[PDB]
Design a protein around this ligand. Sequence first.
Ligand SMILES: [Mg+2]
Ligand SMILES: [Mg+2]
Ligand SMILES: [Mg+2]
Ligand SMILES: [Mg+2]
Ligand SMILES: [Mg+2]
Ligand SMILES: [Mg+2]
Ligand SMILES: [Mg+2]
Ligand SMILES: [Mg+2]
Ligand SMILES: [Mg+2]
Ligand SMILES: [Mg+2]
Ligand SMILES: [Mg+2]
Ligand SMILES: [Mg+2]
Ligand SMILES: [Mg+2]
Ligand SMILES: [Mg+2]
Ligand SMILES: [Mg+2]
Ligand SMILES: [Mg+2]
Ligand SMILES: [Mg+2]
Ligand SMILES: [Mg+2]
Ligand SMILES: [Mg+2]
Ligand SMILES: [Mg+2]
Ligand SMILES: [Mg+2]
Ligand SMILES: [Mg+2]
Ligand SMILES: [Mg+2]
Ligand SMILES: [Mg+2]
Ligand SMILES: [Mg+2]
Ligand SMILES: [Mg+2]
Ligand SMILES: [Mg+2]
Ligand SMILES: [Mg+2]
Ligand SMILES: [Mg+2]
Ligand SMILES: [Mg+2]
Ligand SMILES: [Mg+2]
Ligand SMILES: [Mg+2]
Ligand SMILES: [Mg+2]
Ligand SMILES: [Mg+2]
Ligand SMILES: [Mg+2]
Ligand SMILES: [Mg+2]
Ligand SMILES: [Mg+2]
Ligand SMILES: [Mg+2]
Ligand SMILES: [Mg+2]
Ligand SMILES: [Mg+2]
Ligand SMILES: [Mg+2]
Ligand SMILES: [Mg+2]
Ligand SMILES: [Mg+2]
Ligand SMILES: [Mg+2]
Ligand SMILES: [Mg+2]
Ligand SMILES: [Mg+2]
Lengths: 183, 197, 156, 111, 106, 127
Amino acid sequence: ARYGATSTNPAKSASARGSYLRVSFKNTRETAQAINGWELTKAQKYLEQVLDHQRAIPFRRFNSSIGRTAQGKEFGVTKARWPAKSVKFVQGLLQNAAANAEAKGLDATKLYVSHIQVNQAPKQRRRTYRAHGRINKYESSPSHIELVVTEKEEAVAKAAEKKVVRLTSRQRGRIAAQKRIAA
Amino acid sequence: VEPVVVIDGKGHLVGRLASVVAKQLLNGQKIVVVRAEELNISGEFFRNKLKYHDFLRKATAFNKTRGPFHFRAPSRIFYKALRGMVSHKTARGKAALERLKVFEGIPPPYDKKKRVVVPQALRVLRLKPGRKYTTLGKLSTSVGWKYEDVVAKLEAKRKVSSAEYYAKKRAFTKKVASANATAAESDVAKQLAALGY
Amino acid sequence: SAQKAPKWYPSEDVAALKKTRKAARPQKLRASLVPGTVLILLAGRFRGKRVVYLKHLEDNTLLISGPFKVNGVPLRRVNARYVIATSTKVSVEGVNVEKFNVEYFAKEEIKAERVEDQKVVDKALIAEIKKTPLLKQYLSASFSLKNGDKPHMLKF
Amino acid sequence: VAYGYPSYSTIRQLVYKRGFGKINKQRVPLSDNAIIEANLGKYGILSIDDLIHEIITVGPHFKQANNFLWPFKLSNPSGGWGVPRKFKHFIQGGSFGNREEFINKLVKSMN
Amino acid sequence: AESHRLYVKGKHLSYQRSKRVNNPNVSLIKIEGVATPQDAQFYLGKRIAYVYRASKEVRGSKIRVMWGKVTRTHGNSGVVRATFRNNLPAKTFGASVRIFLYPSNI
Amino acid sequence: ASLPHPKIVKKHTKKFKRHHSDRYHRVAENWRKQKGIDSVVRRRFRGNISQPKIGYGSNKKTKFLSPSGHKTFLVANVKDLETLTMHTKTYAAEIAHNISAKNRVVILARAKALGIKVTNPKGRLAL
RNA sequence: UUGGCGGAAAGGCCUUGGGUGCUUGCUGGCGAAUUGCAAUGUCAUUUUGCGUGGGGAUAAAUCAUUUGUAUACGACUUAGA
RNA sequence: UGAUAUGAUGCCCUGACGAGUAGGCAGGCGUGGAGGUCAGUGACGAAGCCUAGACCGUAAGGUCGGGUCGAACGGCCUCUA
RNA sequence: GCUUUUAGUGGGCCAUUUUUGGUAAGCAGAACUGGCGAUGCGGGAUGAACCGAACGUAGAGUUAAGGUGCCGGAAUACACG
Ligand SMILES: [Mg+2]
Ligand SMILES: [Mg+2]
Ligand SMILES: [Mg+2]
Ligand SMILES: [Mg+2]
Ligand SMILES: [Mg+2]
Ligand SMILES: [Mg+2]
Ligand SMILES: [Mg+2]
Ligand SMILES: [Mg+2]
Ligand SMILES: [Mg+2]
Ligand SMILES: [Mg+2]
Ligand SMILES: [Mg+2]
Ligand SMILES: [Mg+2]
Ligand SMILES: [Mg+2]
Ligand SMILES: [Mg+2]
Ligand SMILES: [Mg+2]
Ligand SMILES: [Mg+2]
Ligand SMILES: [Mg+2]
Ligand SMILES: [Mg+2]
Ligand SMILES: [Mg+2]
Ligand SMILES: [Mg+2]
Ligand SMILES: [Mg+2]
Ligand SMILES: [Mg+2]
Ligand SMILES: [Mg+2]
Ligand SMILES: [Mg+2]
Ligand SMILES: [Mg+2]
Ligand SMILES: [Mg+2]
Ligand SMILES: [Mg+2]
Ligand SMILES: [Mg+2]
Ligand SMILES: [Mg+2]
Ligand SMILES: [Mg+2]
Ligand SMILES: [Mg+2]
Ligand SMILES: [Mg+2]
Ligand SMILES: [Mg+2]
Ligand SMILES: [Mg+2]
Ligand SMILES: [Mg+2]
Ligand SMILES: [Mg+2]
Ligand SMILES: [Mg+2]
Ligand SMILES: [Mg+2]
Ligand SMILES: [Mg+2]
Ligand SMILES: [Mg+2]
Ligand SMILES: [Mg+2]
Ligand SMILES: [Mg+2]
Ligand SMILES: [Mg+2]
Ligand SMILES: [Mg+2]
Ligand SMILES: [Mg+2]
Ligand SMILES: [Mg+2]
């Protein structure tokens, strides 16, 4: 418990986590974001296609010197990629949230992914040998992932304030005469 | 005074017309300038041709695009004189410049709209007689402006229509004059006369 | 203690005002304002209305009337610095006006006395206005500045 | 500096308006004749006009009279200086030196 | 009639300023039809409004007003100096402004 | 209810923040004065931030007064609070930050009895 | 509603005929207040959204696949009920 | 200095003056520990931390609210590094 | 008027006038004063040293040197060439 900020209604939601996972943080950030807000079913089908190289993942923040592909057009993007490992780890967590929704007895057809957040797990050091007897760090960049699915619901109703109006003697005068004068 | 002021550039001196247009803009006055090709510059044609070629050699050495742009059209030669009188890199300046339109010839709706003059930029009032001066259209054409014939053509056509318009009006004001004078010597007339009308 | 005590406290005795010398002398009005003179109202509810000047009250205001039957303005208080005094005048000499003072207008719909007072003053004024042609029409028209009007030039 | 010959008029208005005395230093405004009589009394001079008289006639006690008055503090001229540049001599179209009786027009605009 | 107007038109020109420094406490106003300092002496002390619009209704109107007065004349051409209760926003250089006829001395 | 005072004039209300406190995180906003040789701030070049100086000092009459007109006085308990018994037009009690909730109900109560003003009555109120 | 004109960015101008509202050309009847001595005292035109019902209309582009007159990747150029 | 009211380094009247590196001096702000005191604050929440919320000071800084927290801590006169 | 004690400094540079060396130098070296260095503010577009003017926080007025076709506050002012 204690995820990142959510505006949702917990009664109609289910959630999932994984921590300390060895997956590129940068990569799964871009892939998590590609699913964000999506209808859960459409998202699962989407991810499957990414794996098939039928569609791709828009790389929006960490993209610099990535390649270009026609598969970014869909998203209005030249730079996109097909990060297999990120996808598989996410759909694992997607699959978990689905189960929990079932167990809670939530309608599985109303489900969209309302919250999906990745950030940085502690790193993992390994080392490499560099010319002239030198050593450098070689490091894993693991992620924490969390997502939340919610039952979709209809509109807002209204429920607003009355906006109390305060007008002067000369201001309330014109009003009283306005109806005196005309309709 | 008016929402829009249309200036007929014919016979006006560039820098002095520019100087008064710039100020009006910054004071919130919309201006459209017409017949820019009929504009004047002091000094004989050759001096001002030479001055243009002076301006023509300036360019960014590594890329001629980033460098200064040379617009050949009369309206644009004008806009340059004007834009230099505005602080055009400020919001306030860009605001004032959007209140402006310059045109070669007199294109639609302005052709049927009245246009005015600026006595302090007027060549015939300003230049001492005998001094040599330059027409913007001829200058532009020598530096590459392509449209002088097309404009002169369309103008000659526009000028024929406007002549009929004028003739019909001059005739109508002849009736109105005759009617006005048949009312003269009546009571209401003599009474107005007393009050200065 | 969270904070120490001061060693000294201010006295809570209020002093008395010094004995001020500023007398209220009367306000002499600008010579263009004399009773019977038509005023142009520059502001307020009745702004732009042309109205007749009647009496200078004790609170410095001007007692005016439309007449109500002409332009719809009743017997009323108006502030002398919000008015343009014209040069056109009616003789006011058949108009009582004695009755009307500051207390008359104290706030405390329309009292019948007010409604009768209005009829009695206006009939006198109307009697006088009919004398010069077009004046009543003038009095029923709103003043406004047209294009090219320059107040610092215009004679009123 | 600029200087010249002051008229009775401008001496009079110099003292009535910007005239102050030096009393245990402390630059005291004049404003009542007792202030003068108190400090200049031993020389004669019990009024503000007694002072003025001592100045303009350059009396026997002029030194004590004059030193009694704090240096006058004048504003800039309200007309302006009349010249395009001040630091030429008066004769050369400038403001400095002895402009003689023209000093009154200047000082009155500075007072 | 068609014309209801009780004020003279004007333009917010500048703040009081040097070449390189301005003074938001003073605004320079161009009054229509006033071409000389003498003409402009008529308007000194007249009250000025700058009227504008806003999205939030406040006291019941979507129209707001900044009030000021004409203070001195400015230069030879009939421009006028004026101060306002709060200084004018400076996006209004070139905006229209209303000079009234009160307080009246006529 | 406060002793009458001249209109309170603050004279510079903006906070004096350290030069470059906005440039680098390592530099706190707390005022500190530039000692640099070339520094534009120390040299008062037109366009830069202004530094504290004694000219800004508040009028002796209204100095220390709050908007209401009372000087504020820190209060731990009733005994402290009661030192204001004879000056209610001058000082107001501000209840100390570490006073317990139940104790605050007692100080407020006695405050009311004595007519002594309290600046943070809503503190720790169970509502 | 009639007839005609305008392509420089015409997108507006002129004309015919009946209907209709107003007319301060002139002369009448009624109304106005208490918005309280001023407080812009609110009358303009921008874009958009949500339902209604009066006409009107019933596509394409992209991914993938494919050609090589094209190409580092994108892009280009072909092809596909 | 005159008690019977509260600061004598105080209170009241008055005049003049105000640039600043290196540098001198002065009056103040803040910290760890020490003597004294307020029979100071606190598990009914000490300290700490967060907070384009509030208030006092020209400033160093001080005070409060709210959140988080869990065992100690502060005002004043003095001492000390 | 008089006494004691102690910091920093002991690379300086510029302008008018006097002036030495050098063809000369934004070069090198003296004289008197005023400056920059240590100093912001208005003017000279720009600039250590020029012109004006030396700085507590502010309100109103007036000016300096310099400006007032437009950039830009301020006469597309008057007058003789
Ligand atoms: Mg975690
Ligand atoms: Mg980053
Ligand atoms: Mg990055
Ligand atoms: Mg690449
Ligand atoms: Mg790159
Ligand atoms: Mg590469
Ligand atoms: Mg891209
Ligand atoms: Mg290697
Ligand atoms: Mg090795
Ligand atoms: Mg109405
Ligand atoms: Mg060449
Ligand atoms: Mg008296
Ligand atoms: Mg009088
Ligand atoms: Mg009527
Ligand atoms: Mg003057
Ligand atoms: Mg004069
Ligand atoms: Mg000069
Ligand atoms: Mg004076
Ligand atoms: Mg400057
Ligand atoms: Mg430092
Ligand atoms: Mg510097
Ligand atoms: Mg330096
Ligand atoms: Mg057009
Ligand atoms: Mg529809
Ligand atoms: Mg100092
Ligand atoms: Mg102190
Ligand atoms: Mg200390
Ligand atoms: Mg300590
Ligand atoms: Mg604060
Ligand atoms: Mg507070
Ligand atoms: Mg709390
Ligand atoms: Mg706590
Ligand atoms: Mg514990
Ligand atoms: Mg100590
Ligand atoms: Mg020594
Ligand atoms: Mg030594
Ligand atoms: Mg020594
Ligand atoms: Mg030594
Ligand atoms: Mg010098
Ligand atoms: Mg040398
Ligand atoms: Mg040095
Ligand atoms: Mg120095
Ligand atoms: Mg200096
Ligand atoms: Mg000199
Ligand atoms: Mg420019
Ligand atoms: Mg100007």
